[PDB]
Amino acid sequence: DIVMTQSPDSLAVSLGERATINCKSSQSVLYSSNSKNYLAWYQQKPGQPPKLLIYWASTRESGVPDRFSGSGSGTDFTLTISSLQAEDVAVYYCLQYYSTPYSFGQGTKLEIKR
Amino acid sequence: DIVMTQSPDSLAVSLGERATINCKSSQSVLYSSNSKNYLAWYQQKPGQPPKLLIYWASTRESGVPDRFSGSGSGTDFTLTISSLQAEDVAVYYCLQYYSTPYSFGQGTKLEIKR
């Protein structure tokens, strides 16, 4: 059972600035045969179900703005949102779908800084 | 934490036939304020990240075929696939995104009968 750990649990960022979200997997999710990281990032906006943002660690789901970028490999991953916009307020989750049972991180609540 | 009990583990189907997958949550995932079930169904074809099919128990994701339908409210949910197609041969998981940690059911592997 792979455990996903995100940090920070809460993040306050100003409009137009950069937001950084971390996720660590207890075991590597990099598969040797195809060199792919079975790591994905989800965005759950208020009143909506979680939506897929990035998979394979850095591939953006069609429709997702380029300001959302994923990086990392093995056990250390990062989600970066450049130029934060008001609509980006939500809870972000990382997911490992390398081996069942698939598991999410505990989430990072992103809010606009007071 | 909420536990998702999915069944059956494996399902051998014939093209054009109707497939039924069941999933029960250890606690109700029905939120009072919006009267919505924080329950989703995902499809995972080979070599692809999990793909969202249905959320709010019965709301289909855009682009998802009408032959996929979700039913149930509270704790007992059902995913039905009518007029089964070769493309539908995959593994299916129910997901509860009511409260962290989010959790998937064990999963149901769909295959064509010999």
Domain made up of B1-114: CATH architecture: Sandwich (2.60)
Report DSSP letters for B15-70, one per residue.
TT--EEEEEEESS--EETTTTEE-EEEEEE-TTS--EEEEETTTEEPTT--TTEEE
Q: Do B106 and A101 touch (CB under 8 A)?
A: yes
Locate the domains of chain B by residue range: 1-114
Q: Is the Cβ–Cβ distance between B49 and A55 less than 8 Å?
A: yes
Q: Is the Cβ–Cβ distance between B93 and B107 less than 8 Å?
A: yes
The number of CA neighbours under 13 Å toward the Cβ of B95 is: 26
Query: Which experimental approach was used here?
Result: X-ray
Residues with Cβ within 8 Å of B104's Cβ and at least 6 positions away in sequence, in order, are A101, A102, B4, B6, B42, B93, B94, B95
How far apart are the CA of A106 and the nearest CA of chain B, in angstroms? 6
| Interface A-B: count of C-beta contacts within 8 A | 41
Gap between the Cα atoms of B51 and A102, Å rounded? 13
Q: How many CB atoms lie within 10 A of CB B82?
A: 14
Tell me the resolution in Å: 1.8
Report DSSP letters for B56-112, one per residue.
TTTEEPTT--TTEEEE--SSEEEEEE-S--GGG-SEEEEEE-SSSSPEE-S-EEEEE
Phi, psi of A34 (to 5 degrees): -115, 0
For residue B56, give the nearest of A49, A95, A97 by CB distance: A49
Beta bridge partners of A13: A112
